[PDB]
Amino acid sequence: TYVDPHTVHEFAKELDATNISIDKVVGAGEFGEVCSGRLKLPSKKEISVAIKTLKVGYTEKQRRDFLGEASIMGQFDHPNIIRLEGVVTKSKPVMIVTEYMENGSLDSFLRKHDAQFTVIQLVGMLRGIASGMKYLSDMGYVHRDLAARNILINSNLVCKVSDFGPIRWTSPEAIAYRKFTSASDVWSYGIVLWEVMSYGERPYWEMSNQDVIKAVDEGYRLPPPMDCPAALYQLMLDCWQKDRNNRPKFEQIVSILDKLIRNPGSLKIITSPSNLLLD
Ligand SMILES: Nc1ncnc2c1ncn2[C@@H]1O[C@H](COP(=O)(O)OP(=O)(O)NP(=O)(O)O)[C@@H](O)[C@H]1O
Ligand SMILES: [Mg+2]
C-alpha cells in the first residue's frame, strides 16, 4: 500500500555526493536542472543515472514539493516504474537521483520515429506502461497525470512511468467533479495508447479545451490512428467508456496485451483524420 506524504528518508536512501558524477544537462524541471551522470553503488558497481537538482535560493515550499516526489517514487520498486536511486539532502544542491533512461520522454521519442517501429514493438512499450500502472493501482496510488510525456523509455525501449509530482488526458468524471480513481487512470492509459499508436500526436490536437470536454461528454472519441490494429483501437474505446465501472482494470489490460504479443497475427486486422468519431 502507498502512503500519502501530506520523511523522504523513510523511502529514500541518502547518497554520498562523492559517489555522484555529473556528465551533461539533459532537461529543465519545475525546480531546477536535470542532468545525466553516474552513481557508484556501495558494491562499487557504477551505473548511469539522471540527476535533478533543487535550484539555488529555493523556498521551503519548493524543497518540500521537490522532495515529495522522491517520497512517492521511493515507495514503488517495479521494472516499469522509474527507480529512485536516492537523494542528497545533507549537502547542497539538494538532489534526486533516478535510473537513467537513454531515449528520454516517450512522446518526443516517438515523434522522431514516425511509422518506424513494428506493431509488436509498440505493443511491448504499451505492455510495460500497463504493468507499471497495474502495480501503482495495486498500491492504491492514483497517478492523475498519466500521459506519454510522463513516460520515459530506455535504450532497450523499456517504458517506465514517471512524473510523481491536464484536460486531454483526464476522464470525464475527473474533469466534471474531481472524481479521480484507478478507473480515471485507465481512461488516461487509453489516451497514452492512442498517443503511442499515433507516434506522439497530441490528443485532441489543439481543440479548444471547452470543446475537448463537451465532445467527449457527447460520446465523441479520438479516431483510430493510421494502420491501427482493430484490437488496439477497441482497447482504447474500452478504456474510454463513459461509465467508469465498465472500463477494464489494469490487470485486464496487461492480459489483453500479453495475448496480442503471444498471437502477433491478431494485430493484422486493421481498423477502417483530425476529426472525432461518435463512439
Ligand atoms: N531518468 C531520466 N533519464 C534520462 N532523461 C531524463 C530522466 N528524467 C528526466 N529526463 C529528461 O529531462 C526532461 C525533463 O524531465 P521531466 O521529468 O519531464 O521534468 P519536468 O519538470 O516535467 N520538465 P518538462 O517535462 O520538460 O516540462 C525529460 O523530457 C527527459 O528528456
Ligand atoms: Mg515532464
Side-chain angles (χ1 to χ4, degrees), residues 26-32 34-36 49-52 69 82-83 98-105 107-108 149-150 152-153 162-163:
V26 304
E30 177 172 10
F31 301 101
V34 189
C35 50
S36 60
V49 290
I51 296 170
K52 282 194 184 195
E69 167 159 52
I82 291 290
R83 184 179 171 78
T98 57
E99 68 181 304
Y100 185 61
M101 302 288 288
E102 179 177 344
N103 292 131
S105 303
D107 64 322
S108 57
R149 67 182 181 285
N150 295 323
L152 289 166
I153 176 165
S162 188
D163 178 39

PDB file of all heavy atoms in Angstrom, residues 26-32 34-36 49-52 69 82-83 98-105 107-108 149-150 152-153 162-163, ligand 1:
ATOM      1  N   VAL A  26      20.437  17.559 -19.434  1.00  0.00           N
ATOM      2  CA  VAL A  26      19.508  16.900 -20.368  1.00  0.00           C
ATOM      3  C   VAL A  26      18.075  17.442 -20.328  1.00  0.00           C
ATOM      4  O   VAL A  26      17.204  16.954 -21.057  1.00  0.00           O
ATOM      5  CB  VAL A  26      19.446  15.365 -20.108  1.00  0.00           C
ATOM      6  CG1 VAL A  26      20.834  14.757 -20.190  1.00  0.00           C
ATOM      7  CG2 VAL A  26      18.804  15.070 -18.757  1.00  0.00           C
ATOM      8  N   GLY A  27      17.812  18.429 -19.478  1.00  0.00           N
ATOM      9  CA  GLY A  27      16.457  18.933 -19.331  1.00  0.00           C
ATOM     10  C   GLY A  27      16.353  20.001 -18.271  1.00  0.00           C
ATOM     11  O   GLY A  27      17.322  20.303 -17.587  1.00  0.00           O
ATOM     12  N   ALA A  28      15.162  20.569 -18.150  1.00  0.00           N
ATOM     13  CA  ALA A  28      14.897  21.596 -17.165  1.00  0.00           C
ATOM     14  C   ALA A  28      13.617  21.214 -16.469  1.00  0.00           C
ATOM     15  O   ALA A  28      12.661  20.790 -17.115  1.00  0.00           O
ATOM     16  CB  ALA A  28      14.759  22.943 -17.842  1.00  0.00           C
ATOM     17  N   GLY A  29      13.600  21.340 -15.151  1.00  0.00           N
ATOM     18  CA  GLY A  29      12.437  20.974 -14.377  1.00  0.00           C
ATOM     19  C   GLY A  29      11.815  22.178 -13.718  1.00  0.00           C
ATOM     20  O   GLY A  29      12.355  23.292 -13.764  1.00  0.00           O
ATOM     21  N   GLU A  30      10.671  21.940 -13.090  1.00  0.00           N
ATOM     22  CA  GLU A  30       9.991  22.948 -12.295  1.00  0.00           C
ATOM     23  C   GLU A  30      10.917  23.533 -11.226  1.00  0.00           C
ATOM     24  O   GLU A  30      10.848  24.726 -10.928  1.00  0.00           O
ATOM     25  CB  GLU A  30       8.762  22.307 -11.640  1.00  0.00           C
ATOM     26  CG  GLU A  30       7.962  23.205 -10.716  1.00  0.00           C
ATOM     27  CD  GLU A  30       6.651  22.555 -10.272  1.00  0.00           C
ATOM     28  OE1 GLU A  30       6.448  21.345 -10.528  1.00  0.00           O
ATOM     29  OE2 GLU A  30       5.817  23.260  -9.669  1.00  0.00           O
ATOM     30  N   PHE A  31      11.792  22.693 -10.670  1.00  0.00           N
ATOM     31  CA  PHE A  31      12.594  23.058  -9.501  1.00  0.00           C
ATOM     32  C   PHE A  31      14.085  23.294  -9.769  1.00  0.00           C
ATOM     33  O   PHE A  31      14.803  23.728  -8.871  1.00  0.00           O
ATOM     34  CB  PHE A  31      12.434  21.970  -8.434  1.00  0.00           C
ATOM     35  CG  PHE A  31      11.013  21.778  -7.998  1.00  0.00           C
ATOM     36  CD1 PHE A  31      10.256  20.720  -8.480  1.00  0.00           C
ATOM     37  CD2 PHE A  31      10.424  22.684  -7.129  1.00  0.00           C
ATOM     38  CE1 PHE A  31       8.941  20.558  -8.084  1.00  0.00           C
ATOM     39  CE2 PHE A  31       9.115  22.531  -6.726  1.00  0.00           C
ATOM     40  CZ  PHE A  31       8.365  21.461  -7.207  1.00  0.00           C
ATOM     41  N   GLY A  32      14.544  22.999 -10.981  1.00  0.00           N
ATOM     42  CA  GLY A  32      15.955  23.155 -11.328  1.00  0.00           C
ATOM     43  C   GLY A  32      16.317  22.431 -12.609  1.00  0.00           C
ATOM     44  O   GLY A  32      15.465  22.230 -13.473  1.00  0.00           O
ATOM     45  N   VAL A  34      17.952  19.180 -14.950  1.00  0.00           N
ATOM     46  CA  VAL A  34      18.062  17.729 -14.994  1.00  0.00           C
ATOM     47  C   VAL A  34      19.335  17.411 -15.782  1.00  0.00           C
ATOM     48  O   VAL A  34      19.556  17.953 -16.863  1.00  0.00           O
ATOM     49  CB  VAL A  34      16.842  17.063 -15.675  1.00  0.00           C
ATOM     50  CG1 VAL A  34      16.898  15.539 -15.494  1.00  0.00           C
ATOM     51  CG2 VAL A  34      15.533  17.639 -15.122  1.00  0.00           C
ATOM     52  N   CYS A  35      20.182  16.552 -15.237  1.00  0.00           N
ATOM     53  CA  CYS A  35      21.366  16.124 -15.961  1.00  0.00           C
ATOM     54  C   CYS A  35      21.544  14.614 -15.880  1.00  0.00           C
ATOM     55  O   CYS A  35      20.926  13.948 -15.057  1.00  0.00           O
ATOM     56  CB  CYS A  35      22.603  16.833 -15.419  1.00  0.00           C
ATOM     57  SG  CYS A  35      22.741  16.741 -13.650  1.00  0.00           S
ATOM     58  N   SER A  36      22.386  14.093 -16.759  1.00  0.00           N
ATOM     59  CA  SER A  36      22.773  12.691 -16.745  1.00  0.00           C
ATOM     60  C   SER A  36      24.110  12.620 -16.026  1.00  0.00           C
ATOM     61  O   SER A  36      24.862  13.606 -15.941  1.00  0.00           O
ATOM     62  CB  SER A  36      22.918  12.153 -18.172  1.00  0.00           C
ATOM     63  OG  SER A  36      23.912  12.884 -18.872  1.00  0.00           O
ATOM     64  N   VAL A  49      22.828   7.388 -14.256  1.00  0.00           N
ATOM     65  CA  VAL A  49      21.664   7.938 -13.565  1.00  0.00           C
ATOM     66  C   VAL A  49      21.261   9.287 -14.155  1.00  0.00           C
ATOM     67  O   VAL A  49      22.052   9.933 -14.860  1.00  0.00           O
ATOM     68  CB  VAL A  49      21.971   8.152 -12.078  1.00  0.00           C
ATOM     69  CG1 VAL A  49      22.107   6.810 -11.352  1.00  0.00           C
ATOM     70  CG2 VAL A  49      23.243   9.007 -11.906  1.00  0.00           C
ATOM     71  N   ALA A  50      20.020   9.671 -13.881  1.00  0.00           N
ATOM     72  CA  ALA A  50      19.552  11.035 -14.080  1.00  0.00           C
ATOM     73  C   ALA A  50      19.597  11.730 -12.733  1.00  0.00           C
ATOM     74  O   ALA A  50      19.300  11.126 -11.696  1.00  0.00           O
ATOM     75  CB  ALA A  50      18.148  11.052 -14.626  1.00  0.00           C
ATOM     76  N   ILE A  51      19.898  12.986 -12.790  1.00  0.00           N
ATOM     77  CA  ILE A  51      20.077  13.753 -11.563  1.00  0.00           C
ATOM     78  C   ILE A  51      19.280  15.050 -11.651  1.00  0.00           C
ATOM     79  O   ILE A  51      19.437  15.805 -12.612  1.00  0.00           O
ATOM     80  CB  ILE A  51      21.568  14.104 -11.325  1.00  0.00           C
ATOM     81  CG1 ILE A  51      22.416  12.844 -11.112  1.00  0.00           C
ATOM     82  CG2 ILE A  51      21.721  15.051 -10.131  1.00  0.00           C
ATOM     83  CD1 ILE A  51      23.863  13.115 -11.114  1.00  0.00           C
ATOM     84  N   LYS A  52      18.378  15.306 -10.721  1.00  0.00           N
ATOM     85  CA  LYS A  52      17.572  16.526 -10.672  1.00  0.00           C
ATOM     86  C   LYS A  52      18.052  17.325  -9.477  1.00  0.00           C
ATOM     87  O   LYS A  52      18.189  16.770  -8.384  1.00  0.00           O
ATOM     88  CB  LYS A  52      16.079  16.220 -10.511  1.00  0.00           C
ATOM     89  CG  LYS A  52      15.400  15.763 -11.807  1.00  0.00           C
ATOM     90  CD  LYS A  52      13.892  15.801 -11.726  1.00  0.00           C
ATOM     91  CE  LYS A  52      13.288  15.234 -13.006  1.00  0.00           C
ATOM     92  NZ  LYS A  52      11.844  15.552 -13.168  1.00  0.00           N
ATOM     93  N   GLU A  69       8.228  14.359  -4.336  1.00  0.00           N
ATOM     94  CA  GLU A  69       8.281  13.439  -5.477  1.00  0.00           C
ATOM     95  C   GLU A  69       9.110  12.201  -5.159  1.00  0.00           C
ATOM     96  O   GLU A  69       8.722  11.092  -5.509  1.00  0.00           O
ATOM     97  CB  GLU A  69       8.900  14.093  -6.704  1.00  0.00           C
ATOM     98  CG  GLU A  69       9.249  13.069  -7.789  1.00  0.00           C
ATOM     99  CD  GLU A  69       9.386  13.688  -9.141  1.00  0.00           C
ATOM    100  OE1 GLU A  69      10.155  14.681  -9.257  1.00  0.00           O
ATOM    101  OE2 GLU A  69       8.712  13.182 -10.078  1.00  0.00           O
ATOM    102  N   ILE A  82       9.820   4.254 -12.754  1.00  0.00           N
ATOM    103  CA  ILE A  82      11.172   4.844 -12.616  1.00  0.00           C
ATOM    104  C   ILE A  82      11.735   4.620 -11.211  1.00  0.00           C
ATOM    105  O   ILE A  82      11.056   4.878 -10.192  1.00  0.00           O
ATOM    106  CB  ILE A  82      11.223   6.341 -12.969  1.00  0.00           C
ATOM    107  CG1 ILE A  82      11.011   6.543 -14.466  1.00  0.00           C
ATOM    108  CG2 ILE A  82      12.547   6.930 -12.592  1.00  0.00           C
ATOM    109  CD1 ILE A  82      12.202   6.062 -15.294  1.00  0.00           C
ATOM    110  N   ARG A  83      12.952   4.100 -11.189  1.00  0.00           N
ATOM    111  CA  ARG A  83      13.646   3.706  -9.975  1.00  0.00           C
ATOM    112  C   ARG A  83      14.339   4.886  -9.348  1.00  0.00           C
ATOM    113  O   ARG A  83      15.135   5.563 -10.011  1.00  0.00           O
ATOM    114  CB  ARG A  83      14.694   2.647 -10.311  1.00  0.00           C
ATOM    115  CG  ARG A  83      15.415   2.098  -9.099  1.00  0.00           C
ATOM    116  CD  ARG A  83      16.425   1.025  -9.470  1.00  0.00           C
ATOM    117  NE  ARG A  83      17.261   0.635  -8.343  1.00  0.00           N
ATOM    118  CZ  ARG A  83      16.867  -0.179  -7.359  1.00  0.00           C
ATOM    119  NH1 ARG A  83      15.645  -0.704  -7.358  1.00  0.00           N
ATOM    120  NH2 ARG A  83      17.706  -0.493  -6.379  1.00  0.00           N
ATOM    121  N   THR A  98      17.777   9.192 -10.091  1.00  0.00           N
ATOM    122  CA  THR A  98      16.938   8.131 -10.633  1.00  0.00           C
ATOM    123  C   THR A  98      17.688   7.339 -11.691  1.00  0.00           C
ATOM    124  O   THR A  98      18.742   7.764 -12.167  1.00  0.00           O
ATOM    125  CB  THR A  98      15.653   8.702 -11.252  1.00  0.00           C
ATOM    126  OG1 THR A  98      15.999   9.661 -12.258  1.00  0.00           O
ATOM    127  CG2 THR A  98      14.777   9.348 -10.189  1.00  0.00           C
ATOM    128  N   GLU A  99      17.157   6.170 -12.055  1.00  0.00           N
ATOM    129  CA  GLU A  99      17.750   5.402 -13.137  1.00  0.00           C
ATOM    130  C   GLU A  99      17.745   6.222 -14.444  1.00  0.00           C
ATOM    131  O   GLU A  99      16.813   6.955 -14.710  1.00  0.00           O
ATOM    132  CB  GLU A  99      17.017   4.066 -13.350  1.00  0.00           C
ATOM    133  CG  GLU A  99      15.631   4.185 -13.886  1.00  0.00           C
ATOM    134  CD  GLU A  99      14.962   2.833 -14.050  1.00  0.00           C
ATOM    135  OE1 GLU A  99      15.506   1.943 -14.751  1.00  0.00           O
ATOM    136  OE2 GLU A  99      13.881   2.682 -13.487  1.00  0.00           O
ATOM    137  N   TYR A 100      18.809   6.077 -15.221  1.00  0.00           N
ATOM    138  CA  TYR A 100      18.936   6.785 -16.488  1.00  0.00           C
ATOM    139  C   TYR A 100      18.128   6.106 -17.578  1.00  0.00           C
ATOM    140  O   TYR A 100      18.175   4.881 -17.720  1.00  0.00           O
ATOM    141  CB  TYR A 100      20.394   6.761 -16.916  1.00  0.00           C
ATOM    142  CG  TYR A 100      20.662   7.563 -18.165  1.00  0.00           C
ATOM    143  CD1 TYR A 100      20.421   8.928 -18.200  1.00  0.00           C
ATOM    144  CD2 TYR A 100      21.153   6.945 -19.304  1.00  0.00           C
ATOM    145  CE1 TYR A 100      20.665   9.669 -19.348  1.00  0.00           C
ATOM    146  CE2 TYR A 100      21.399   7.672 -20.443  1.00  0.00           C
ATOM    147  CZ  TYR A 100      21.158   9.029 -20.462  1.00  0.00           C
ATOM    148  OH  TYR A 100      21.373   9.672 -21.501  1.00  0.00           O
ATOM    149  N   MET A 101      17.410   6.918 -18.353  1.00  0.00           N
ATOM    150  CA  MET A 101      16.555   6.417 -19.434  1.00  0.00           C
ATOM    151  C   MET A 101      17.033   7.081 -20.728  1.00  0.00           C
ATOM    152  O   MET A 101      16.713   8.244 -21.000  1.00  0.00           O
ATOM    153  CB  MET A 101      15.090   6.721 -19.133  1.00  0.00           C
ATOM    154  CG  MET A 101      14.630   6.126 -17.813  1.00  0.00           C
ATOM    155  SD  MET A 101      14.451   4.330 -17.877  1.00  0.00           S
ATOM    156  CE  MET A 101      12.967   4.190 -18.896  1.00  0.00           C
ATOM    157  N   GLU A 102      17.827   6.355 -21.509  1.00  0.00           N
ATOM    158  CA  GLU A 102      18.597   6.977 -22.594  1.00  0.00           C
ATOM    159  C   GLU A 102      17.742   7.662 -23.666  1.00  0.00           C
ATOM    160  O   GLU A 102      18.149   8.691 -24.227  1.00  0.00           O
ATOM    161  CB  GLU A 102      19.531   5.955 -23.239  1.00  0.00           C
ATOM    162  CG  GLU A 102      20.348   6.517 -24.408  1.00  0.00           C
ATOM    163  CD  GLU A 102      21.311   5.514 -24.983  1.00  0.00           C
ATOM    164  OE1 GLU A 102      21.575   4.496 -24.314  1.00  0.00           O
ATOM    165  OE2 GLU A 102      21.818   5.755 -26.107  1.00  0.00           O
ATOM    166  N   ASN A 103      16.571   7.100 -23.959  1.00  0.00           N
ATOM    167  CA  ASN A 103      15.705   7.674 -25.001  1.00  0.00           C
ATOM    168  C   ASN A 103      14.667   8.702 -24.529  1.00  0.00           C
ATOM    169  O   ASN A 103      13.796   9.131 -25.318  1.00  0.00           O
ATOM    170  CB  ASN A 103      15.080   6.542 -25.823  1.00  0.00           C
ATOM    171  CG  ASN A 103      16.126   5.797 -26.649  1.00  0.00           C
ATOM    172  OD1 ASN A 103      16.207   4.560 -26.644  1.00  0.00           O
ATOM    173  ND2 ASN A 103      16.943   6.557 -27.329  1.00  0.00           N
ATOM    174  N   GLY A 104      14.785   9.125 -23.263  1.00  0.00           N
ATOM    175  CA  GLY A 104      14.030  10.272 -22.740  1.00  0.00           C
ATOM    176  C   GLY A 104      12.521  10.062 -22.691  1.00  0.00           C
ATOM    177  O   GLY A 104      12.048   8.935 -22.514  1.00  0.00           O
ATOM    178  N   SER A 105      11.769  11.148 -22.869  1.00  0.00           N
ATOM    179  CA  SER A 105      10.296  11.111 -22.783  1.00  0.00           C
ATOM    180  C   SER A 105       9.696  10.426 -24.021  1.00  0.00           C
ATOM    181  O   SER A 105      10.149  10.635 -25.164  1.00  0.00           O
ATOM    182  CB  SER A 105       9.738  12.527 -22.631  1.00  0.00           C
ATOM    183  OG  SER A 105      10.294  13.163 -21.480  1.00  0.00           O
ATOM    184  N   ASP A 107       6.821  10.564 -25.696  1.00  0.00           N
ATOM    185  CA  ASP A 107       6.122  11.280 -26.757  1.00  0.00           C
ATOM    186  C   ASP A 107       7.112  11.888 -27.751  1.00  0.00           C
ATOM    187  O   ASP A 107       6.950  11.711 -28.947  1.00  0.00           O
ATOM    188  CB  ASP A 107       5.148  12.334 -26.233  1.00  0.00           C
ATOM    189  CG  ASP A 107       5.840  13.457 -25.476  1.00  0.00           C
ATOM    190  OD1 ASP A 107       6.807  13.195 -24.740  1.00  0.00           O
ATOM    191  OD2 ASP A 107       5.393  14.610 -25.632  1.00  0.00           O
ATOM    192  N   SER A 108       8.137  12.571 -27.243  1.00  0.00           N
ATOM    193  CA  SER A 108       9.149  13.172 -28.121  1.00  0.00           C
ATOM    194  C   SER A 108       9.979  12.100 -28.852  1.00  0.00           C
ATOM    195  O   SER A 108      10.379  12.300 -29.998  1.00  0.00           O
ATOM    196  CB  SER A 108      10.050  14.139 -27.341  1.00  0.00           C
ATOM    197  OG  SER A 108      10.676  13.493 -26.257  1.00  0.00           O
ATOM    198  N   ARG A 149       4.145  11.977 -22.370  1.00  0.00           N
ATOM    199  CA  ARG A 149       5.244  12.864 -21.954  1.00  0.00           C
ATOM    200  C   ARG A 149       5.775  12.518 -20.547  1.00  0.00           C
ATOM    201  O   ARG A 149       6.895  12.903 -20.178  1.00  0.00           O
ATOM    202  CB  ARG A 149       4.826  14.339 -22.048  1.00  0.00           C
ATOM    203  CG  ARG A 149       3.757  14.732 -21.051  1.00  0.00           C
ATOM    204  CD  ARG A 149       3.311  16.187 -21.169  1.00  0.00           C
ATOM    205  NE  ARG A 149       2.296  16.463 -20.142  1.00  0.00           N
ATOM    206  CZ  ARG A 149       1.031  16.041 -20.190  1.00  0.00           C
ATOM    207  NH1 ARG A 149       0.593  15.342 -21.227  1.00  0.00           N
ATOM    208  NH2 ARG A 149       0.185  16.322 -19.196  1.00  0.00           N
ATOM    209  N   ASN A 150       4.959  11.788 -19.774  1.00  0.00           N
ATOM    210  CA  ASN A 150       5.316  11.373 -18.416  1.00  0.00           C
ATOM    211  C   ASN A 150       5.750   9.911 -18.302  1.00  0.00           C
ATOM    212  O   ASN A 150       5.846   9.348 -17.204  1.00  0.00           O
ATOM    213  CB  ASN A 150       4.146  11.689 -17.487  1.00  0.00           C
ATOM    214  CG  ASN A 150       3.906  13.180 -17.390  1.00  0.00           C
ATOM    215  OD1 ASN A 150       4.864  13.964 -17.384  1.00  0.00           O
ATOM    216  ND2 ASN A 150       2.649  13.583 -17.305  1.00  0.00           N
ATOM    217  N   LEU A 152       9.027   7.496 -19.554  1.00  0.00           N
ATOM    218  CA  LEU A 152      10.422   7.539 -20.013  1.00  0.00           C
ATOM    219  C   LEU A 152      10.747   6.196 -20.657  1.00  0.00           C
ATOM    220  O   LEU A 152      10.174   5.181 -20.296  1.00  0.00           O
ATOM    221  CB  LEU A 152      11.373   7.856 -18.841  1.00  0.00           C
ATOM    222  CG  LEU A 152      11.336   9.288 -18.268  1.00  0.00           C
ATOM    223  CD1 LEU A 152      12.040   9.392 -16.912  1.00  0.00           C
ATOM    224  CD2 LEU A 152      11.977  10.289 -19.253  1.00  0.00           C
ATOM    225  N   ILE A 153      11.684   6.193 -21.603  1.00  0.00           N
ATOM    226  CA  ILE A 153      11.965   4.979 -22.356  1.00  0.00           C
ATOM    227  C   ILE A 153      13.482   4.803 -22.444  1.00  0.00           C
ATOM    228  O   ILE A 153      14.185   5.774 -22.716  1.00  0.00           O
ATOM    229  CB  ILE A 153      11.266   5.007 -23.748  1.00  0.00           C
ATOM    230  CG1 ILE A 153      11.657   3.778 -24.550  1.00  0.00           C
ATOM    231  CG2 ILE A 153      11.530   6.306 -24.516  1.00  0.00           C
ATOM    232  CD1 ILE A 153      10.763   3.527 -25.760  1.00  0.00           C
ATOM    233  N   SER A 162       6.701   7.751 -14.901  1.00  0.00           N
ATOM    234  CA  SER A 162       7.441   8.823 -14.238  1.00  0.00           C
ATOM    235  C   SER A 162       6.440   9.880 -13.735  1.00  0.00           C
ATOM    236  O   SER A 162       5.232   9.628 -13.721  1.00  0.00           O
ATOM    237  CB  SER A 162       8.456   9.435 -15.220  1.00  0.00           C
ATOM    238  OG  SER A 162       9.309  10.354 -14.543  1.00  0.00           O
ATOM    239  N   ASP A 163       6.941  11.044 -13.318  1.00  0.00           N
ATOM    240  CA  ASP A 163       6.096  12.192 -13.019  1.00  0.00           C
ATOM    241  C   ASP A 163       5.244  11.950 -11.768  1.00  0.00           C
ATOM    242  O   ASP A 163       4.014  12.028 -11.809  1.00  0.00           O
ATOM    243  CB  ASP A 163       5.212  12.521 -14.227  1.00  0.00           C
ATOM    244  CG  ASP A 163       4.275  13.672 -13.977  1.00  0.00           C
ATOM    245  OD1 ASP A 163       4.694  14.635 -13.322  1.00  0.00           O
ATOM    246  OD2 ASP A 163       3.117  13.587 -14.430  1.00  0.00           O
TER     247      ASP A 163
HETATM  248  N1  LIG B   1      15.584   9.266 -15.703  1.00  0.00           N
HETATM  249  C1  LIG B   1      15.860  10.034 -16.792  1.00  0.00           C
HETATM  250  N2  LIG B   1      16.747   9.661 -17.747  1.00  0.00           N
HETATM  251  C2  LIG B   1      17.033  10.420 -18.827  1.00  0.00           C
HETATM  252  N3  LIG B   1      16.445  11.618 -19.046  1.00  0.00           N
HETATM  253  C3  LIG B   1      15.557  12.110 -18.154  1.00  0.00           C
HETATM  254  C4  LIG B   1      15.213  11.339 -16.949  1.00  0.00           C
HETATM  255  N4  LIG B   1      14.314  12.045 -16.248  1.00  0.00           N
HETATM  256  C5  LIG B   1      14.097  13.191 -16.952  1.00  0.00           C
HETATM  257  N5  LIG B   1      14.848  13.230 -18.077  1.00  0.00           N
HETATM  258  C6  LIG B   1      14.915  14.285 -19.139  1.00  0.00           C
HETATM  259  O1  LIG B   1      14.653  15.585 -18.610  1.00  0.00           O
HETATM  260  C7  LIG B   1      13.475  16.118 -19.228  1.00  0.00           C
HETATM  261  C8  LIG B   1      12.639  16.841 -18.196  1.00  0.00           C
HETATM  262  O2  LIG B   1      12.364  15.944 -17.129  1.00  0.00           O
HETATM  263  P1  LIG B   1      10.892  15.737 -16.523  1.00  0.00           P
HETATM  264  O3  LIG B   1      10.963  14.557 -15.589  1.00  0.00           O
HETATM  265  O4  LIG B   1       9.924  15.712 -17.671  1.00  0.00           O
HETATM  266  O5  LIG B   1      10.707  17.036 -15.587  1.00  0.00           O
HETATM  267  P2  LIG B   1       9.584  18.173 -15.817  1.00  0.00           P
HETATM  268  O6  LIG B   1       9.679  19.065 -14.609  1.00  0.00           O
HETATM  269  O7  LIG B   1       8.252  17.506 -16.085  1.00  0.00           O
HETATM  270  N6  LIG B   1      10.087  19.130 -17.175  1.00  0.00           N
HETATM  271  P3  LIG B   1       9.213  19.192 -18.676  1.00  0.00           P
HETATM  272  O8  LIG B   1       8.568  17.831 -18.822  1.00  0.00           O
HETATM  273  O9  LIG B   1      10.253  19.465 -19.718  1.00  0.00           O
HETATM  274  O10 LIG B   1       8.232  20.333 -18.509  1.00  0.00           O
HETATM  275  C9  LIG B   1      12.739  14.936 -19.862  1.00  0.00           C
HETATM  276  O11 LIG B   1      11.975  15.316 -21.004  1.00  0.00           O
HETATM  277  C10 LIG B   1      13.862  13.994 -20.210  1.00  0.00           C
HETATM  278  O12 LIG B   1      14.377  14.289 -21.520  1.00  0.00           O
END
